[PDB]
Amino acid sequence: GSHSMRYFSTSVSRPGRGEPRFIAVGYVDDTQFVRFDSDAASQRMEPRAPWIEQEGPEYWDEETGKVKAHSQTDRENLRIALRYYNQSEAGSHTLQMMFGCDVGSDGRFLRGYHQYAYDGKDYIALKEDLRSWTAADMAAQITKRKWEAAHVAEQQRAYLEGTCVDGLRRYLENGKETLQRTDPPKTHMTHHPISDHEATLRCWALGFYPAEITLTWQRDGEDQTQDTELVETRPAGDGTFQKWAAVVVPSGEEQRYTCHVQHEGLPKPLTLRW
């Protein structure tokens, strides 16, 4: 019922090899729809979903302008973080940003996000009250004090509660066929002896959207949390997702094990048994 919009940006400094590389991508829920790459020839925000290609030329000009300004801002922020942490200009460093919003089935604002990571660890994040910041260390507390004095958080609220919500609502309508559908998992299981004493049972979920899913193995009704091999949900490449969960079972006892699949596209949770 609820939906999200997120932009993810990465700036990576390359000492001796030019200005930092900046990459930004936009998602609605689990569907990517735009990208920008500062090393690419075009220097334009580019469509990555069929339904965003309806947007007119003023959209692409304006979004290009915004993402280019971000690339220059975080270029500067890398140099500032370098100074706050007392680091040399010899090494390569990473600054990541995520921002966007969650909306309810209502369509109305639920949450907004505006957060940074430096070299893979939290730097500063906007708290849920959209009035205050959470800073990860003493370096980020410098930025926190400066941003509190300048009321940076307040000046983000129009975007987070207005533009973001409005844009998300427009994408969900324009991409309705894609973004508002639910593809349930197609499920199956495989069975491989690994000895004459044990066998692997693997529970598969294929072709599903959105990416959220739960696969769990039970033995005689008891969850087998610490004996299950569970892979990270992975993209099929066609906009749907895959996952599997496996357990090693004593040969001849396959029938005590059940795989349980929950997904928003299933009216009913599934139970699979070999």
Binding site: Y7, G26, V67, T73, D74, I142, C164
Partner: peptide, 9 residues
């Protein structure tokens, strides 16, 4: 829709 991001650390 992207945001306008100009604020520095």
């Amino acid at each position: 829709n992207y945001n306008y991001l100009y604020r520095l650390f």
